[PDB]
């Protein structure tokens, strides 16, 4: 179990397209890089993945099992991914605890920045509640409202800074974890 609190951003450095599989090499920030090793299972954009290789600051993952239910297949070199390593000495399982099991891909309907808030409206596709949390790209937060097929999450603006939520646009695909 993870908290859905993103600890840093990685930047995709390389992608190997073999694609019912892809290998992503992601540049990690020093503090995260030094806590991981081959075999580390951690969350990348909310998705549980295993470190295959580390060379200097580039941490590699093979996306295979996850390839059909996540955004990785369509990511590009330079893109920013959310990173979270499991709690070191345990945690109290809330609430919005994440498993890293991504239920599927959804799409940003609308984004508005106003009043110290990042308001994010996500359209949930047919084949994929409002008192629950939801994980989006590994960010766990309470749902604000649901209207039709669209879920409204009202994030504090600081999450714009510390996660890739602040790069999202109308039409951006995201990894959704429902809980549960
Ligand atoms: C531990 C783990 N490692 C990987 C991995 O290295 N590569 C991969 O593609 N999938 C892994 N998985 C499974 C994914 O977390 C799971 O397939 C997705 O969350 C489903 O959307 C898991 C659970």
Burial class (CB in 10 A: 0-12, 13-18, 19+), 54: middle
H or E, element range at 145: strand 145-147
State which residues form the domain around 82. Answer: 1-92
CA dist., res. 96 & res. 133, Å (int): 5
127 three-state secondary structure: coil
Q: Are residues 147 and 171 in the same domain?
A: yes
As a whole number of angstroms, the distance between CA 7 and CA 3 comes to 10
Closest-CA residue, ligand 1 atom 2, reads 49
The residue length of the chain stands at: 180
d(CA 34, CA 171): 35
**Same domain flag for 30 and 113:** no
- 91 labeled part of a ligand binding site: no
CA angle 133, 128, 93 (to 5 degrees): 30
Determine the distance separating the centroid of ligand 1 and the alpha carbon of 47, expressed in angstroms.
7
What is the DSSP code (8-state) at residue 131? T
Instruction: Tell which of 39, 74, 92 closes a domain.
Output: 92
Whether the ω angle into residue 43 lies within 30 degrees of 0, i.e. cis, is no
Q: Please tell me what resolution, in angstroms, this structure has.
A: 2.0
Coil, helix or strand at residue 94: coil
Q: Which of 148, 151, 132 is nearest to 140 (CA)?
A: 132
Question: Cα–Cα distance between 156 and 77 in angstroms, integer?
Answer: 28
88 and 122 share a domain?
Answer: no
DSSP per residue, 26-91:
EEPPHHHHTT--TT-EEEETTEEEEEEEEETTEEEEEESTTTTSSSGGG--TT-EEEEEPPPTT--
Residue finishing a domain among 44, 67, 92:
92
Does the Cβ of 102 fall within 6 Å of ligand 1? yes
User: How many angstroms separate the CA atoms of 14 and 12, rounded?
Assistant: 6
In terms of domains, do 17 and 87 share one? Answer: yes
Token pair listed for 30: 């020093």
Number of domains in the chain: 2
- Does the CB atom of residue 51 touch ligand 1 within 6 A? no
């Amino acid at each position: 179990m993870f908290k859905g609190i993103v600890q840093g951003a990685g930047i995709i450095k390389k992608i190997s397209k073999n694609d019912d599989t892809q290998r992503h090499g992601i540049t990690f920030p020093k503090d995260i890089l030094e806590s991981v090793e081959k075999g580390t299972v951690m969350l990348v954009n909310g998705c549980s993945l295993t470190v295959v290789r580390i060379s200097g600051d580039v941490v590699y993952f093979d996306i295979d099992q996850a390839i059909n239910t996540t955004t990785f297949r369509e990511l590009e070199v330079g893109n920013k991914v959310n990173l979270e390593v499991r709690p070191e000495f345990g945690s109290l399982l809330g609430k919005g605890a994440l498993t890293g099991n991504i239920k599927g891909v959804a799409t940003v309907d609308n984004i508005t920045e106003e009043e110290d808030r990042l308001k994010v409206y996500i359209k949930i596709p047919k084949d994929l509640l409002s008192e629950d949390h939801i994980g989006i790209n590994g960010v766990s937060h309470s749902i604000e409202e649901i209207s039709d097929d669209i879920i409204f999450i009202n994030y504090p603006k600081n999450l714009s800074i510390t996660t890739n939520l602040g790069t999202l646009e109308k039409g951006s695909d995201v990894n959704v974890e429902t809980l549960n």
